[PDB]
Amino acid sequence: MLEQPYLDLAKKVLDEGHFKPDRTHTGTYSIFGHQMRFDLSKGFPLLTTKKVPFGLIKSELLWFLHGDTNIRFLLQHRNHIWDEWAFEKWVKSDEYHGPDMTDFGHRSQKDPEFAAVYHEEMAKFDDRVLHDDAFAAKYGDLGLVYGSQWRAWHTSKGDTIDQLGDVIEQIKTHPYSRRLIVSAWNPEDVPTMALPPCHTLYQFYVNDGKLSLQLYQRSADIFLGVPFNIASYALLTHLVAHECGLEVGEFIHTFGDAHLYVNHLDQIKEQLSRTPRPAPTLQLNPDKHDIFDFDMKDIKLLNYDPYPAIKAPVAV
Amino acid sequence: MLEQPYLDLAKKVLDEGHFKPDRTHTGTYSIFGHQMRFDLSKGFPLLTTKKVPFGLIKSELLWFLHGDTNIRFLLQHRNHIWDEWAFEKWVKSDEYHGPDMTDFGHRSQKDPEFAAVYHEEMAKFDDRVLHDDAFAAKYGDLGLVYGSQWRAWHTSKGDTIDQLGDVIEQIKTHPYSRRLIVSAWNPEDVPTMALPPCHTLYQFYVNDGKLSLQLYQRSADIFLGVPFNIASYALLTHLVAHECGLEVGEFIHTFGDAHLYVNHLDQIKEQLSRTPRPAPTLQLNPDKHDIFDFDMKDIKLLNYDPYPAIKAPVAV
Ligand SMILES: O=C1OC(c2ccc(O)c(Cl)c2)(c2ccc(O)c(Cl)c2)c2cccc3cccc1c23
Ligand SMILES: O=C1OC(c2ccc(O)c(Cl)c2)(c2ccc(O)c(Cl)c2)c2cccc3cccc1c23
């Protein structure tokens, strides 16, 4: 079935993965160098052996296309994927006055009550973003994130570069170009960034009318991250294809370090004993063709009938 | 045998490659997304089914490690891989006074005598580089090339970044880092560069003491380029391993668009009917450990007994 390459990866890291302790106290099983190929003509590669919330994928990708870097948009969509990154800079700024919140992520699963304190503090942070415009622009804006690096790269000569925007024109006027590349890696910011881009660099390709995209992911969290990652880029390909009036081809997922956190073993194992159902389909508004102006409603996912979700502790 | 992955690629592009005309008048057969794995413990991946001049690989890589961007070094080693790029800017500069030399590369194989004129003009260009220091610094320096982008990336804040140098320290003090990355792609320079980096981005990896490197090549010339490319990076891995006192592991070669120019068909086909001999070995000076100061003599290749070279026209 379509998603087989993902399961084959999970089974692989379990069988051939060498134990590798990492940054977080939770150890991992990792491998280096892997590639998966998904034929987008067979359907949208969203996992059926587990219920991945497609909503979040949309909410985040559109955020990216809009050159947005403010968490407000996501909170305004019930998406909370980046909250912690912004909140972190809030508890450190000499303006916040409450609990210590030192590396809260870890304490949020080892000490009861504190977690409630955390979720409580987070609620006020999030609330002040959606309503207090000044607060939103101060702590809601991440600055260095996919949205800006994709569509507002900063030059040495004080200006900005619309990478994706240009590459799209390129596909349109020079489809056979082997230079259809977009990078999120900037040597200048990387030494100090909190979380350097995992989805380091991607490339487009056009052949016989079908568009394809390869993604170089320097790091991957097989159980939690990868299921989303695949969807984001499978979607991104459709979008770029929709605008360029091209048919959709393949999505090639290349990994640097693909890993599995130890406390996800039983969950992934249980997932491996699930037979995949037929892949879903994606419906993109046939009228609207300028993806940057796209909105949630302009993307539909049909026949998605996945298995129940699998609860697993986030690694910290 | 060790190099099998390369031959398997050639056979693949011939069998599954879709015809794709390109920038140059010579068409190609190309594919998108491929990965080759070489176990450096079995030997240095230099082709035995064809005689690749290892000398040039050295000459160029050391040039890179030295943060050099001046062709003089290469000419001072009989290496002429980058000559044309520098020479091109010489025939355009209002100081040169001789033949037109418009896109000489193409005319150098269609019109007799002109080729002799070209090689003649080139001789004077090269000569004036090795001897006239002022000329060397003006036209011998390429500016934007692997040497500088690896070891002298320019920031927006008017300074420079020693990417490779830092990453090496990183391997030493944080080997298990999933961020051991070096990029040659800069969104600011890419829109105007003559030849944007083919070897777009690479990543290191450490596990059980063995170092490994993955290379993302957005474009590849299977017959002419790839044989060299593999060697350069297989060597680079050994060097970084030598300094970091680590053992050598694998070299993962990932491709964006891997292609084969039509006028290389018969040559590659003839190469495919050649049985590979045992792989050679690499000897790195056991005394010297700081690779940046490495010199030609510090690298040895043993048991290299390849087949005769295969002459093939360069694509233009
Ligand atoms: O790699 C990280 O992870 C952390 C992380 C991870 C996921 C996530 O969504 C968020 Cl916001 C934060 C993190 C968080 C809690 C911890 O207990 C530890 Cl050890 C590390 C993290 C928290 C704070 C600063 C950080 C700086 C660099 C790398 C991480 C990092
Ligand atoms: O992609 C290229 O290739 C060219 C090339 C290729 C290999 C090489 O070592 C050198 Cl220096 C130059 C080139 C050269 C001769 C030609 O007839 C044509 Cl069409 C194109 C080339 C020559 C001049 C300017 C160029 C600008 C962009 C891309 C190329 C390019």
Swiss-Prot record, chains A, B:
- Location (main, coarse): cytoplasm
Say which enzyme class the record assigns: transferase
* PROSITE patterns (alphabetical): THYMIDYLATE_SYNTHASE
Q: Is Metal-binding one of the keywords?
A: no
Q: Which residues bind dUMP?
A: R23, R178, R179, R218, S219, A220, D221, N229, H259, L260, Y261
According to the UniProt entry, what is the EC number of this protein? 2.1.1.45
Q: Which residues are involved in binding (6R)-5,10-methylene-5,6,7,8-tetrahydrofolate? A: D221, A315
Alphabetical GO CC annotations of the entry are: cytosol
Spell out the reaction equation it catalyses. dUMP + (6R)-5,10-methylene-5,6,7,8-tetrahydrofolate = 7,8-dihydrofolate + dTMP
The UniProt keywords, alphabetically, are: Cytoplasm, Methyltransferase, Nucleotide biosynthesis, Transferase
Write out the pathway annotation from the protein's UniProt entry: Pyrimidine metabolism; dTTP biosynthesis
Single GO term (MF) = thymidylate synthase activity
**Which cellular compartments is it found in?**
Cytoplasm
Q: Pfam families per the record? A: Thymidylat_synt
Subunit details: Homodimer.
Q: Which family does it belong to?
A: Belongs to the thymidylate synthase family. Bacterial-type ThyA subfamily.
**Entry function:** Catalyzes the reductive methylation of 2'-deoxyuridine-5'-monophosphate (dUMP) to 2'-deoxythymidine-5'-monophosphate (dTMP) while utilizing 5,10-methylenetetrahydrofolate (mTHF) as the methyl donor and reductant in the reaction, yielding dihydrofolate (DHF) as a by-product. This enzymatic reaction provides an intracellular de novo source of dTMP, an essential precursor for DNA biosynthesis.
Q: What is the protein name given in its UniProt record?
A: Thymidylate synthase
